[PDB]
Amino acid sequence: ANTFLVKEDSKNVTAYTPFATPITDSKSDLVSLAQLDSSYQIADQTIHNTNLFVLFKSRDVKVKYESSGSNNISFDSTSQGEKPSYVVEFTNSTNIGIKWTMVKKYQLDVPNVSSDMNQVLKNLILEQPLTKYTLNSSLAKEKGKTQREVHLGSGQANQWTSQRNQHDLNNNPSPNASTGFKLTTGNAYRKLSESWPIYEPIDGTKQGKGKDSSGWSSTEENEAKNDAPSVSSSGTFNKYLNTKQALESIGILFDDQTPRNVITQLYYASTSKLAVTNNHIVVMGNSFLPSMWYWVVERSAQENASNKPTWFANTNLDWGEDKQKQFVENQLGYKETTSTNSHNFHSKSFTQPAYLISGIDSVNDQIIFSGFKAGSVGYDSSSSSSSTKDQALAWSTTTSLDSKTGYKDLVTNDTGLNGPINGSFSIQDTFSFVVPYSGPIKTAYPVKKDQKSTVKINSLINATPLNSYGDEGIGVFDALGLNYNFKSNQERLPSRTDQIFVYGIVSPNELRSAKSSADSTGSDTKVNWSNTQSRYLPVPYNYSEGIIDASVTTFSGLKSIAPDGFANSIANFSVGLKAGIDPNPVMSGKKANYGAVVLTRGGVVRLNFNPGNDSLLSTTDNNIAPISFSFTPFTAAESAVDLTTFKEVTYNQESGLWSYIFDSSLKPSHDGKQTPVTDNMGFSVITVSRTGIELNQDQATTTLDVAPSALAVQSGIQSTTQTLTGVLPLSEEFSAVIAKDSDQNKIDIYKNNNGLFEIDTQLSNSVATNNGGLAPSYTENRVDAWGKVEFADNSVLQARNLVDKTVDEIINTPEILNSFFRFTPAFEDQKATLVATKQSDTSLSVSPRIQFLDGNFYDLNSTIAGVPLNIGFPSRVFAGFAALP
Ligand SMILES: [K+]
């Protein structure tokens, strides 16, 4: 379509021309049109084959989780709670203007709960969500029991070497390796039926009550409300932050001052992004909260059909290598055939249960996704005397120093496969948190053989891509990517459980298996997505300060200098996954290239695909890192963009460029210290381009051993003073910004100067002078948005002997009618031609056809959405041509 769709507010979408003007009467309330009540809002939208697909969600949604019986997850039918999310297909019913009509409506039903799933869900506990204001110390949790304290006990230390073989820990050199973190302090963990607090501990190693809900509601909540009162009063904020406004801003739903239960937050967050193919509509969660399910809706689905979501716990991904999946799964929980009521995701044969999804997109008939693996480990929930009582079972899985350099060798290294190994080591005088070595060294799950049947190991899901929160040195180095080998090349030692980025391309058949997994009766049915990969993607270490390397730096002491809008410098985040077809042609006989980009903290990730079979791009050499992923670090200008203010990402096929829009109005109203936020004005635009040698350019590039990449550039289009309406990327050379510098909409034209966009004030003024019409005015004597056209005098015909030629000959000779005017372009390479019309046997008229900022030509008959633009182009009559030859 020749128009740009601009979401005006949470309900209205307006169609805009390339001249940054709204099409008259195009403003449409899509919630009302979808026959949804006013509690609904637009979550996301996409165009598929000229139709508009809109995802809607209700602020009134109330979900319940009942442990007893069946159909455990349900909408709260009392009062106004049965408000499921919907996907609606709209069509434009008019040839003149925009008139949206609803074609299909798809309800997104709550997930089915099998018996095996419900045994995990009953004791499932979820960490309170990370906000803009969560500190590194907020995330820090008290260190758990050592490997020796768990297996041997409180007696002595010298018996490790002689008793480790009985507990299957042969040659394990780490009796003081941590088995996890305590759940009696720190960030709140809540059951599906429970609610998270609006309070965040400043120091989670001392404050907060962890999973101790009763301890929070009886003593600590009073302490928190006293220290951190919500604004009206003036509080202290010595011990807790009050992030209520930051929680509302990331989609946390409330009943006055109380957040709704966890399952409501999960349902509401899970219906945030959509992607459309010929057969399917796919719905995924947002990047603020972990999601446990996604919807695969068959476009053929009949009206008033409940569309069921598929659990990620039933969705087996290819993590790159089987060991990579084994690392994640072994740390999910304790799996043992001789234990009663010890149900977790591992013991019940489920896979990774949750992700922080960056987004979803479609290219051809393929779905592309990405996200971070949300941390998920086992925890001891028993009551009486357990050594790990109220402790989460988590440990570092960073590759050892003596590992062979080569991607496959590093990621399949056995270090920390089944249990703890890393911590603190000093060989001669060289210190490392990582083991120097890998019969063989034995790792084992942190459950002692005696308390095997009497143990209750359940599941937890973290709010970030970290598994282990334990306040020790290894945690910092794992989260920041600071573990390096002592070899000549000095390679980075990867984690296999912390900061794991996930991505893939999903086919129609893989979507069909997810749909049957979602509709399966009885026991769980599984889906395998084979064109997926994983990647250790830590946060930049330069987002932190004062780290000791040669007393160690832990989470409770780590100083954040993160410039990207987060108070923390340890948890990764991603946003705006967007795919795009490369406009650059491939060699004959090869399919058109396409890729995807996504923003992460401190850089852009590029995803690479082989379009020959819609697979991930790969290379034969296993020593090379999977070439379907490439990470490019941001410079200071990109790192300064507040990633929590991401509004939207668009791709332009002609330019081959992605445009990421950031809107500062998306910032919360108040701080964690209940202080009004004042830098909520303005916006920013990041432009992403591809870099490197692409596939199928010539015979030499039919195979690749180097991953194509991307480059994010804070383009020069930004403001700290205007309220943004929209950014129109007209061409590689120009962008139009619609903003309010008051209550009224203003048009600003930004011109691309050798990679850097700069405001062109004279062009802005030309474009904005439309006199209430849809397009910029036309003035004869001015070099305006249409350049300047000066017509030759009629005397040119006699002087050049063109009078001997006929009207029909002149009209059929482009080079001649180009000599009837002189053009002055308003911008370099702006083109103009004359359109000729016979008026009589001896005369014709000419009218210019002129290129605008979008690269398109406009003339007297031009329309947008079928509406005549009536620009005001002149007509010039030339007379005195021969009647016949
Ligand atoms: K002009």
Side-chain angles (χ1 to χ4, degrees):
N2 43 33
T3 73
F4 295 82
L5 302 179
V6 165
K7 187 178 123 180
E8 272 200 28
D9 53 44
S10 75
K11 294 176 164 66
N12 292 276
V13 170
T14 306
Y16 274 76
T17 67
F19 317 105
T21 60
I23 284 145
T24 306
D25 303 309
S26 71
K27 188 181 163 177
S28 311
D29 181 341
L30 297 183
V31 169
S32 171
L33 193 60
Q35 299 170 5
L36 298 168
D37 66 69
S38 61
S39 71
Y40 284 88
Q41 297 169 306
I42 297 166
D44 196 14
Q45 67 208 86
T46 199
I47 292 284
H48 182 81
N49 289 347
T50 75
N51 280 1
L52 175 66
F53 295 75
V54 189
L55 168 65
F56 301 98
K57 60 200 207 172
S58 170
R59 287 165 289 195
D60 293 357
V61 75
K62 284 175 176 169
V63 186
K64 296 192 289 188
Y65 170 75
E66 262 101 354
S67 213
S68 72
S70 283
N71 306 91
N72 309 95
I73 298 162
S74 74
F75 292 113
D76 186 9
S77 301
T78 60
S79 309
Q80 304 187 139
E82 200 143 27
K83 263 103 181 281
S85 298
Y86 283 88
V87 172
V88 179
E89 171 175 14
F90 296 102
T91 202
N92 174 20
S93 67
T94 61
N95 295 320
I96 321 297
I98 307 286
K99 182 83 131 64
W100 297 116
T101 293
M102 176 179 222
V103 179
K104 293 272 289 197
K105 192 168 168 173
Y106 307 95
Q107 191 193 272
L108 309 181
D109 202 16
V110 285
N112 275 334
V113 189
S114 78
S115 173
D116 283 350
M117 182 58 81
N118 201 44
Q119 292 185 275
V120 186
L121 295 180
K122 61 169 157 64
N123 296 113
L124 177 61
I125 229 107
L126 292 91
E127 192 187 19
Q128 70 181 94
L130 176 130
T131 70
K132 221 175 180 312
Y133 303 112
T134 309
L135 301 164
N136 285 345
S137 49
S138 293
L139 286 162
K141 281 161 196 77
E142 276 184 272
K143 215 147 80 172
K145 297 281 153 80
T146 69
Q147 273 215 101
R148 169 160 57 214
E149 287 174 301
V150 175
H151 290 112
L152 317 172
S154 302
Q156 44 191 271
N158 292 42
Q159 78 277 32
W160 174 257
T161 332
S162 59
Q163 282 194 59
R164 66 195 178 176
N165 289 36
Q166 283 123 282
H167 300 94
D168 300 316
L169 288 150
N170 324 293
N171 302 128
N172 194 290
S174 329
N176 304 297
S178 190
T179 63
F181 54 92
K182 301 207 61 41
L183 301 169
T184 49
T185 60
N187 269 351
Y189 283 86
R190 298 283 180 273
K191 289 201 246 181
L192 294 172
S193 192
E194 293 178 325
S195 300
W196 286 311
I198 64 163
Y199 308 104
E200 296 189 28
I202 280 160
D203 177 3
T205 251
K206 295 184 199 298
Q207 273 62 58
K209 282 285 166 191
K211 67 170 189 64
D212 182 16
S213 190
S214 299
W216 177 262
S217 58
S218 71
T219 67
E220 210 49 50
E221 192 181 27
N222 167 69
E223 226 69 283
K225 190 197 184 187
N226 288 338
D227 178 60
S230 297
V231 74
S232 294
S233 261
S234 57
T236 328
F237 308 93
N238 275 356
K239 306 293 177 196
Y240 293 91
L241 294 182
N242 181 330
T243 59
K244 187 196 180 288
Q245 298 90 331
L247 291 156
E248 293 194 75
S249 283
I250 63 162
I252 297 294
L253 293 175
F254 286 81
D255 292 318
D256 189 24
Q257 302 295 300
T258 323
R260 299 203 178 123
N261 36 337
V262 172
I263 193 75
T264 303
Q265 311 304 348
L266 291 174
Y267 175 86
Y268 186 80
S270 80
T271 64
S272 289
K273 304 291 173 56
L274 96 167
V276 186
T277 70
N278 292 326
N279 294 110
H280 304 103
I281 289 169
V282 189
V283 182
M284 294 199 177
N286 60 40
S287 50
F288 298 116
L289 262 91
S291 53
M292 299 203 275
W293 54 76
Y294 57 96
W295 284 260
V296 176
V297 183
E298 284 294 334
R299 289 189 54 196
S300 68
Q302 308 87 34
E303 201 52 81
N304 272 72
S306 297
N307 301 281
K308 251 75 168 66
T310 315
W311 296 86
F312 279 128
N314 286 331
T315 310
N316 295 309
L317 301 183
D318 186 338
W319 291 73
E321 300 296 337
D322 209 83
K323 210 154 283 170
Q324 283 174 277
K325 192 163 145 83
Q326 285 171 51
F327 265 96
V328 173
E329 290 182 345
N330 292 349
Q331 209 168 128
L332 287 176
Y334 189 49
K335 178 165 206 156
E336 187 67 359
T337 52
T338 41
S339 210
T340 188
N341 221 113
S342 185
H343 312 296
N344 60 75
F345 287 112
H346 197 215
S347 71
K348 291 308 262 171
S349 279
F350 290 111
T351 192
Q352 178 56 33
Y355 299 94
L356 292 126
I357 303 290
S358 328
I360 192 159
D361 203 9
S362 51
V363 165
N364 309 134
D365 246 16
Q366 316 299 305
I367 286 297
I368 291 149
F369 78 97
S370 75
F372 272 98
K373 173 190 75 56
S376 191
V377 297
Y379 82 97
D380 193 345
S381 84
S382 73
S383 188
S384 192
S385 317
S386 207
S387 52
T388 60
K389 199 194 113 193
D390 307 333
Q391 190 201 296
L393 308 182
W395 61 88
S396 175
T397 61
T398 294
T399 302
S400 70
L401 301 164
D402 79 334
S403 182
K404 183 79 214 71
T405 67
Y407 195 86
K408 188 185 176 189
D409 289 314
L410 297 168
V411 297
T412 67
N413 190 279
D414 271 24
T415 306
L417 223 198
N418 303 287
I421 188 76
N422 299 325
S424 59
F425 304 94
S426 63
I427 175 164
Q428 260 73 48
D429 278 90
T430 58
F431 187 81
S432 64
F433 295 120
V434 169
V435 270
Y437 325 113
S438 63
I441 301 106
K442 226 275 175 183
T443 55
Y445 198 85
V447 168
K448 108 157 158 141
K449 279 174 162 280
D450 306 69
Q451 51 167 92
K452 173 187 73 177
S453 57
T454 72
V455 82
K456 197 171 177 177
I457 307 303
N458 299 136
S459 280
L460 73 74
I461 291 158
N462 294 327
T464 76
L466 306 176
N467 259 33
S468 55
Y469 283 123
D471 201 43
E472 59 181 332
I474 189 65
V476 171
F477 275 47
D478 287 1
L480 303 208
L482 287 164
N483 297 296
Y484 279 84
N485 62 25
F486 300 120
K487 219 250 170 285
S488 216
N489 197 273
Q490 278 182 285
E491 303 249 66
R492 184 223 264 165
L493 270 25
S495 165
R496 265 74 55 94
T497 51
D498 298 288
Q499 312 275 51
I500 306 309
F501 189 76
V502 124
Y503 63 94
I505 187 162
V506 189
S507 65
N509 288 347
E510 285 174 327
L511 287 186
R512 290 177 190 117
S513 318
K515 177 65 181 153
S516 60
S517 177
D519 299 325
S520 106
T521 64
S523 197
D524 302 274
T525 290
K526 316 295 179 163
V527 209
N528 304 312
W529 284 358
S530 53
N531 299 296
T532 58
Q533 252 288 352
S534 82
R535 194 64 146 250
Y536 170 64
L537 186 51
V539 289
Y541 54 77
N542 63 31
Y543 273 22
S544 299
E545 212 164 48
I547 310 163
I548 317 143
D549 48 61
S551 75
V552 292
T553 310
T554 69
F555 298 140
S556 71
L558 189 68
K559 307 178 214 293
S560 171
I561 59 156
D564 61 353
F566 290 107
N568 89 88
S569 62
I570 63 169
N572 221 325
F573 174 84
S574 70
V575 78
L577 175 96
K578 189 70 192 73
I581 292 152
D582 195 343
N584 298 329
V586 285
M587 66 199 280
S588 63
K590 301 306 245 250
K591 311 216 180 80
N593 273 331
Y594 64 88
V597 295
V598 53
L599 300 181
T600 68
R601 297 184 73 190
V604 61
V605 342
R606 164 78 193 272
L607 305 178
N608 303 301
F609 310 96
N610 188 334
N613 64 333
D614 298 315
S615 69
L616 294 178
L617 194 69
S618 58
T619 199
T620 51
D621 193 2
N622 289 335
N623 296 304
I624 307 177
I627 64 158
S628 54
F629 176 103
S630 192
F631 173 79
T632 304
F634 280 170
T635 68
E638 294 80 47
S639 278
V641 173
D642 181 343
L643 292 174
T644 77
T645 69
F646 173 77
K647 170 146 267 286
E648 61 175 67
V649 54
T650 62
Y651 179 70
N652 183 276
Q653 206 166 307
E654 191 186 346
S655 68
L657 296 176
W658 292 267
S659 307
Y660 285 79
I661 318 305
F662 297 88
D663 188 343
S664 297
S665 74
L666 294 178
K667 286 183 197 201
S669 64
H670 300 79
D671 254 358
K673 284 177 232 69
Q674 291 296 285
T675 305
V677 168
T678 47
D679 65 330
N680 63 321
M681 291 303 290
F683 56 88
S684 192
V685 178
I686 283 171
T687 303
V688 182
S689 58
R690 304 167 163 83
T691 68
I693 310 153
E694 299 297 331
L695 187 87
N696 296 333
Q697 296 300 294
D698 46 271
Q699 181 51 43
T701 64
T702 57
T703 50
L704 289 172
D705 58 345
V706 175
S709 211
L711 176 76
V713 162
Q714 166 47 54
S715 67
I717 304 159
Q718 55 183 134
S719 175
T720 52
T721 56
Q722 311 185 278
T723 299
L724 180 72
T725 292
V727 181
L728 312 195
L730 309 178
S731 60
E732 176 162 11
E733 199 182 354
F734 299 99
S735 274
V737 171
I738 313 145
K740 318 167 114 122
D741 241 334
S742 42
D743 53 311
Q744 304 294 335
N745 272 336
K746 201 173 109 64
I747 302 159
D748 280 335
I749 298 300
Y750 285 80
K751 184 181 204 156
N752 186 9
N753 188 9
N754 295 304
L756 198 126
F757 276 102
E758 294 153 355
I759 192 156
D760 192 310
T761 71
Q762 291 197 291
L763 254 187
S764 297
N765 181 245
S766 294
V767 176
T769 303
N770 47 44
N771 300 129
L774 289 171
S777 62
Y778 187 99
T779 310
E780 189 181 359
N781 82 92
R782 291 210 236 110
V783 175
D784 55 19
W786 304 106
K788 187 181 182 171
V789 167
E790 305 169 75
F791 291 108
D793 189 57
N794 200 67
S795 64
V796 76
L797 315 183
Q798 277 285 342
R800 310 217 299 105
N801 299 116
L802 264 33
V803 294
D804 290 321
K805 289 170 181 156
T806 190
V807 175
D808 290 332
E809 183 165 315
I810 306 287
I811 289 179
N812 303 317
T813 314
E815 308 281 5
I816 289 173
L817 68 164
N818 124 95
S819 74
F820 291 173
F821 81 124
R822 181 217 266 119
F823 185 66
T824 305
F827 61 94
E828 193 183 21
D829 304 324
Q830 176 182 38
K831 301 281 150 203
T833 66
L834 292 185
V835 177
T837 302
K838 185 173 186 175
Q839 291 299 329
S840 76
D841 293 335
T842 64
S843 73
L844 54 90
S845 60
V846 285
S847 190
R849 186 175 152 267
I850 307 175
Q851 251 183 353
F852 181 64
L853 301 184
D854 60 356
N856 299 312
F857 282 90
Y858 295 88
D859 62 33
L860 288 169
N861 293 298
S862 300
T863 59
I864 294 291
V867 185
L869 297 170
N870 288 306
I871 283 151
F873 294 114
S875 290
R876 191 85 167 186
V877 169
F878 287 91
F881 301 107
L884 14 98

